[PDB]
Design an enzyme around this catalytic site. Structure first.
Site, mmCIF file in Angstrom:
data_model
loop_
_atom_site.group_PDB
_atom_site.id
_atom_site.type_symbol
_atom_site.label_atom_id
_atom_site.label_comp_id
_atom_site.label_asym_id
_atom_site.label_seq_id
_atom_site.Cartn_x
_atom_site.Cartn_y
_atom_site.Cartn_z
ATOM 1 N N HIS A 4 -49.582 29.399 -81.133
ATOM 2 C CA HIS A 4 -50.115 27.975 -81.101
ATOM 3 C C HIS A 4 -51.025 28.116 -80.193
ATOM 4 O O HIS A 4 -52.469 27.518 -79.031
ATOM 5 C CB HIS A 4 -48.923 26.672 -80.560
ATOM 6 C CG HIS A 4 -48.693 26.703 -79.257
ATOM 7 N ND1 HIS A 4 -47.404 27.185 -78.744
ATOM 8 C CD2 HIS A 4 -49.015 25.843 -77.572
ATOM 9 C CE1 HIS A 4 -47.067 26.901 -77.302
ATOM 10 N NE2 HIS A 4 -48.597 26.168 -76.730
ATOM 11 N N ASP A 63 -43.629 30.858 -83.770
ATOM 12 C CA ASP A 63 -44.559 30.909 -82.050
ATOM 13 C C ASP A 63 -44.549 32.429 -81.887
ATOM 14 O O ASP A 63 -44.220 31.853 -80.492
ATOM 15 C CB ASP A 63 -44.298 29.437 -81.695
ATOM 16 C CG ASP A 63 -45.374 29.129 -81.184
ATOM 17 O OD1 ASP A 63 -46.361 29.239 -80.949
ATOM 18 O OD2 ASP A 63 -45.336 27.900 -80.488
ATOM 19 N N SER A 95 -46.224 28.032 -71.759
ATOM 20 C CA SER A 95 -46.348 28.338 -72.794
ATOM 21 C C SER A 95 -47.315 30.181 -73.327
ATOM 22 O O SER A 95 -47.924 30.771 -72.431
ATOM 23 C CB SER A 95 -47.534 27.710 -74.196
ATOM 24 O OG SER A 95 -47.188 25.937 -74.379
ATOM 25 N N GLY A 96 -46.989 30.121 -73.898
ATOM 26 C CA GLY A 96 -46.424 32.820 -74.207
ATOM 27 C C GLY A 96 -45.713 32.849 -73.509
ATOM 28 O O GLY A 96 -45.852 33.598 -73.477
HETATM 29 C C1 JJX Z 1 -48.687 22.478 -75.151
HETATM 30 C C2 JJX Z 1 -47.686 22.800 -76.426
HETATM 31 C C3 JJX Z 1 -48.093 21.891 -77.641
HETATM 32 C C4 JJX Z 1 -49.737 22.045 -78.171
HETATM 33 N N1 JJX Z 1 -50.532 22.432 -78.473
HETATM 34 C C5 JJX Z 1 -46.998 21.089 -78.706
HETATM 35 C C6 JJX Z 1 -47.173 22.817 -79.706
HETATM 36 C C7 JJX Z 1 -47.325 22.634 -80.857
HETATM 37 C C8 JJX Z 1 -47.485 23.719 -82.161
HETATM 38 C C9 JJX Z 1 -45.986 24.944 -81.751
HETATM 39 C C10 JJX Z 1 -45.795 25.624 -82.633
HETATM 40 N N2 JJX Z 1 -45.744 26.300 -83.094
HETATM 41 C C11 JJX Z 1 -45.771 24.500 -80.483
HETATM 42 C C12 JJX Z 1 -45.807 23.514 -79.775
HETATM 43 N N3 JJX Z 1 -46.449 21.210 -77.968
HETATM 44 C C13 JJX Z 1 -44.902 20.147 -79.460
HETATM 45 C C14 JJX Z 1 -46.083 18.845 -80.044
HETATM 46 O O1 JJX Z 1 -46.147 18.536 -78.845
HETATM 47 N N4 JJX Z 1 -44.945 17.379 -80.050
HETATM 48 C C15 JJX Z 1 -44.323 18.014 -80.817
HETATM 49 C C16 JJX Z 1 -44.384 17.799 -83.026
HETATM 50 N N5 JJX Z 1 -44.984 15.674 -82.285
HETATM 51 C C17 JJX Z 1 -44.906 15.964 -84.131
HETATM 52 C C18 JJX Z 1 -44.609 14.903 -84.164
HETATM 53 C C19 JJX Z 1 -45.703 16.599 -84.948
HETATM 54 C C20 JJX Z 1 -46.269 15.614 -82.120
HETATM 55 C C21 JJX Z 1 -45.869 16.328 -80.188
HETATM 56 C C22 JJX Z 1 -45.743 21.449 -77.061
HETATM 57 O O2 JJX Z 1 -44.625 21.110 -76.661
HETATM 58 N N6 JJX Z 1 -46.378 21.882 -76.328
HETATM 59 C C23 JJX Z 1 -45.894 22.434 -74.677
HETATM 60 C C24 JJX Z 1 -46.144 21.589 -73.260
HETATM 61 C C25 JJX Z 1 -45.480 21.768 -72.889
HETATM 62 C C26 JJX Z 1 -44.497 22.894 -72.349
HETATM 63 C C27 JJX Z 1 -44.435 24.082 -73.554
HETATM 64 C C28 JJX Z 1 -44.082 25.763 -73.433
HETATM 65 F F1 JJX Z 1 -44.499 26.455 -74.338
HETATM 66 F F2 JJX Z 1 -44.624 25.564 -72.462
HETATM 67 F F3 JJX Z 1 -42.801 25.170 -73.421
HETATM 68 C C29 JJX Z 1 -45.536 23.628 -74.605
#
Ligand code: JJX
Ligand SMILES: *[C@@H]1O[C@H](CO[C@@H]2O[C@@H](C)[C@@H](O)[C@@H](O)[C@@H]2O)[C@@H](O)[C@H](O)[C@H]1NC(C)=O
Ligand SMILES: *[C@@H]1O[C@H](CO[C@@H]2O[C@@H](C)[C@@H](O)[C@@H](O)[C@@H]2O)[C@@H](O)[C@H](O)[C@H]1NC(C)=O
Ligand code: NAG
Length: 215
Positions: free
Chosen positions: A41, A88, A170-171
């Site tokens: 991602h 991911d 992330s990562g």
């Molecule tokens: C940055 C981010 C997103 C983006 N771009 C994003 C993401 C997108 C795809 C994948 C895959 N495969 C993994 C995560 N994400 C999840 C996220 O934003 N949502 C979860 C899915 N939701 C549905 C309704 C479609 C929308 C909101 C996330 O938590 N984050 C997120 C936020 C804070 C920390 C982290 C991590 F990786 F450190 F855990 C991740």
């Protein structure tokens, strides 16, 4: 990382900062002198020919002679599915090999299929937000949980307070027993909700695939 502490300088010499436009955007893990791994991602929607791969870093706001900077030559992904938050994981091949020293070391991975039980004590780390971006590498004691986690993630929770990984983390690797068991993937209810386990790409399900890429 919300609610953690400063890592000792170069405590985790496999820890990598992916940068764009002079700024950290994601973590990664050096898994061979010329390959890093991260979250798919992080590089979806980025020009990968522009990503700078920073090894040997500690304080990102400082000039550090210990740093080694690489470009990305090529990426590899196995069934990345953003819609279901699955697979991911991405391997970036570098345009050269790292000089292996005190500041820059290849991480150790689990055997294929190795599962962590509920209650295993791990360390998460990264340069993501403190709640304000981190200049100094942060680390955090976390606990593996199977509750509120699907089969297709390794999940962890800080027991008893609000703390966990955040944007920019992330990562980044999850280290359990000296071994990289997760790559930071997603949070729920915002960062450090106090309730939803953080979710990591489960590195152990991908080890045969990683091995054949790195050789
Ligand atoms: C940055 C981010 C997103 C983006 N771009 C994003 C993401 C997108 C795809 C994948 C895959 N495969 C993994 C995560 N994400 C999840 C996220 O934003 N949502 C979860 C899915 N939701 C549905 C309704 C479609 C929308 C909101 C996330 O938590 N984050 C997120 C936020 C804070 C920390 C982290 C991590 F990786 F450190 F855990 C991740
Ligand atoms: C490998 O790449 C290093 C960093 O390259 C820099 O960042 C990339 C993403 C491009 O913007 C590039 O023009 C920048 O210089 C180089 O410093 C290094 O020499 C390269 N190694 C090689 C070509 O063997
Ligand atoms: C906090 O974590 C410290 C380091 O954890 C250990 O080392 C890392 C690299 C991983 O291998 C992890 O699985 C290990 O547990 C511990 O030394 C310290 O005891 C921990 N403290 C608490 C309260 O968990
Ligand atoms: C990487 C690291 O610091 N690991 C430590 C280990 O040295 C120590 O014996 C133990 C104490 O519980 O905590 C863990």
């Amino acid at each position: 990382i919300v609610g953690g502490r400063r890592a000792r300088p170069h405590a985790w010499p496999f820890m990598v900062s992916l940068q764009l436009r002079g700024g950290h955007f994601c973590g990664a893990t050096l898994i061979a002198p010329n390959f890093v791994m991260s979250a798919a991602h992080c590089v979806a929607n980025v020009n990968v020919r522009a990503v700078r791969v920073v090894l040997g870093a500690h304080n990102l706001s400082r000039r550090e002679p210990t740093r080694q900077v690489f470009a990305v030559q090529r990426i590899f992904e196995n069934g990345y599915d953003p819609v279901n938050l699955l697979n991911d994981i991405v391997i970036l091949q570098l345009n050269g090999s790292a000089t292996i020293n005190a500041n820059v070391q290849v991480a150790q991975l689990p055997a294929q299929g190795r599962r962590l039980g509920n209650g295993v004590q791990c360390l998460a780390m990264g340069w993501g937000l403190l709640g304000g971006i981190a200049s100094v590498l942060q680390e955090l004691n976390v606990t593996v949980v199977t509750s509120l986690c699907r089969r297709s993630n390794v999940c962890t929770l800080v027991r008893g307070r609000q703390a966990g990984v955040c944007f920019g983390d992330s990562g980044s690797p999850l280290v359990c027993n000296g071994l990289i068991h997760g790559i930071a993937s997603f949070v729920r209810g915002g960062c450090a909700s106090g309730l939803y386990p953080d979710a990591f790409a489960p590195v152990a399900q991908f080890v045969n695939w990683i091995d054949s890429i790195i050789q």
